[PDB]
């Protein structure tokens, strides 16, 4: 239950929460109502989980893109500002929080990514992405790098991916057709290729995250980064001589950041909706409230016209809005959660070399579409979707079901799909439903094959082929040999994701050599797996998932 007579507010950890707490202080002075500001990790995910049970904060801040999904889930109160109040904010900021014709949140501020550069290293920053390699080469000669930014969140890579023609959905005539998706298209491929080539050529590192990029920039090690207005405070503290400017072009077209409007929604389960409204309209959305938050971490271009006017001469804000005009306002529709998850997965897979750029985008769009059109809304529907595609691939090739060359790609894609959706729905992998599905293929497709091992009669890459061949062998072996012939309590034979483990007696630590799947695995080091005193494979207590110890493979 949410407690009545106070306000709990959630906001992300990169924003000015200390400044927002000072606004809370003013509210409590006047009204006696205590305002607590929190910044949980993964709050955009945590909000719908706790609010679904009628719990959570009274007020949730995020960019507007997540809010339609929240509204669809019944988690948000419709807000009711009057005409006089609406007039105090820019019409286009209201449009960002308008979903099915209703206002679902209060708009706070317009955010867009810019190119941030170190004037002491690079007084004339590059106008194009194409000149960044040669520039990095020069800088590396001096112990510096050209560019570091957060590669882990697709927000930061989308500007490049969109530049030459990637898009989420197109807003035409007031509507979004969620069947027309621009993730798997030539322009997205060109921009993602360019990003991947930067990594291949060691101009960037696939592991770079927010904290690493911020620290490299703020220490003077990298001449450029990509970030939003919230980041300028820490730069100021570091005393780097920086400029904020237009993002580089790609193939002669602007980088297109996805523009967010920091927004504040009211939990449908709050017993304090009136207090929340008062706080938001009469304390936060005033020149004085917004100043308090902005002084802590810059907001960007605020939605309140009076304060936006006061700050409009900041060249950093001007740069922010020039980038915003080149990009596109994010949709607020429910499909955004799946869109972002898709782009994240594509980028991670392509940047690591796990998939080609073409395969990464193609799979990302396929699995996103499954959610966008409502076919897949949970793991049970996901598994049905993965199986149905697999069946469609296997049915016409029946005479070749025992030929690894014909079935390897369908079988690998089956696992990619089952595992994608497990991660998506916060489940482990392997898991019992996915295992049931894999056993089913062994039963209906592979039962006439003479061998436990896969055998022959585009193909998978080296690593994937090694993993999938081992997987197939493992399931076939379980099918062959269900029985335990010895007396006693035994863990059963099992596939852990990477390796097959024989049945063993309760209270055994089984050992095998590290698999030769990865260039950074030592195939002379050991993998261990514990079969507990009750005959159950050990589960890691941090996750409660059955867990093999690969920690020594990698050292």
């Amino acid at each position: 239950k949410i407690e009545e007579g106070k306000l709990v507010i959630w906001i992300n950890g990169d924003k000015g929460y200390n400044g927002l707490a000072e606004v809370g202080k003013k509210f409590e002075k006047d009204t006696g109502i205590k305002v607590t500001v929190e910044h949980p990790d993964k709050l955009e995910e945590k909000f719908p989980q706790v609010a679904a049970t009628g719990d959570g904060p009274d007020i949730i801040f995020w960019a507007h893109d997540r809010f339609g999904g929240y509204a669809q889930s019944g988690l948000l109160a419709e807000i009711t500002p009057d005409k006089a109040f609406q007039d105090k904010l820019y019409p286009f900021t209201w449009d960002a929080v308008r979903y099915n014709g209703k206002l679902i949140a209060y708009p706070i501020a317009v955010e867009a990514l810019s190119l941030i550069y170190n004037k002491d290293l690079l007084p004339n920053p590059p106008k194009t992405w194409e000149e960044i390699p040669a520039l990095d080469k020069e800088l590396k000669a001096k112990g510096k790098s050209a560019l570091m930014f957060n590669l882990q969140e697709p927000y930061f890579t989308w500007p490049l991916i969109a530049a030459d023609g990637g898009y989420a959905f197109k807003y035409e005539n007031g509507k979004y057709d969620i069947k027309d998706v621009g993730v798997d298209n030539a322009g997205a491929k060109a921009g993602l290729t360019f990003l991947v080539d930067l990594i291949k050529n060691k101009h960037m590192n696939a592991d770079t995250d927010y904290s690493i990029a911020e620290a490299a920039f703020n220490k003077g090690e990298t001449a450029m980064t990509i970030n939003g207005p919230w980041a300028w405070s820490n730069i100021d503290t570091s005393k780097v001589n920086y400029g904020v400017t237009v993002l580089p072009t790609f193939k002669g077209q602007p980088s297109k950041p996805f523009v967010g409007v920091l927004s504040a929604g009211i939990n449908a389960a709050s017993p304090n909706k009136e207090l929340a409204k008062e706080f938001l309209e009469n304390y936060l959305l005033t020149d004085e409230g917004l100043e308090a938050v902005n002084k802590d971490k810059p907001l960007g271009a605020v939605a309140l016209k009076s304060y936006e006017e006061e700050l409009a001469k900041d060249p950093r804000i001007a740069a922010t809005m020039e980038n915003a005009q080149k990009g596109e306002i994010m949709p607020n529709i429910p499909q955004m959660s799946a869109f972002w998850y898709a782009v994240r997965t594509a980028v991670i897979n392509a940047a690591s070399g796990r998939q080609t750029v073409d395969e990464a985008l193609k799979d990302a769009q396929t699995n996103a579409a499954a959610e966008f059109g409502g076919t897949v809304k949970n793991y049970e529907t996901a598994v049905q979707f993965c199986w149905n595609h697999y069946k469609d691939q296997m049915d016409p090739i029946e005479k070749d079901w025992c030929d690894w060359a014909m079935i390897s790609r369908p079988y690998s894609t089956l696992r990619d799909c089952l595992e994608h959706f497990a991660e998506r729905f916060d489940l482990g992998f392997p898991n019992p439903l996915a295992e049931r599905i894999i056993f089913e293929t062994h039963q209906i497709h592979f039962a006439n094959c003479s061998l436990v091992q896969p055998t022959f009669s585009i193909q998978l890459g080296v690593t994937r082929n090694k993993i999938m061949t081992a997987q197939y062998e493992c399931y076939q072996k379980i099918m062959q040999d269900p029985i335990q012939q010895a007396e006693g309590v035994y863990c059963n034979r099992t596939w852990d994701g990477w390796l097959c483990w024989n049945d063993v007696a309760a209270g055994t630590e089984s050992m095998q050599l590290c698999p030769d799947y990865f260039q950074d695995f030592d195939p002379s080091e050991k993998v261990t797996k514990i079969c507990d005193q009750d005959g159950n494979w050990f589960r890691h207590p941090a996750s409660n998932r059955t867990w093999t110890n690969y920690t020594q493979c990698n050292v």
Binding site: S352, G428, G461, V462, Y517, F518, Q519, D520, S543, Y550
Partner: peptide, 18 residues
Amino acid sequence: DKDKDNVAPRSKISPQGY
């Protein structure tokens, strides 16, 4: 052997992984 994936995914080694 350079045709193998470079880096084992850390997430699969973590307590959340395999």
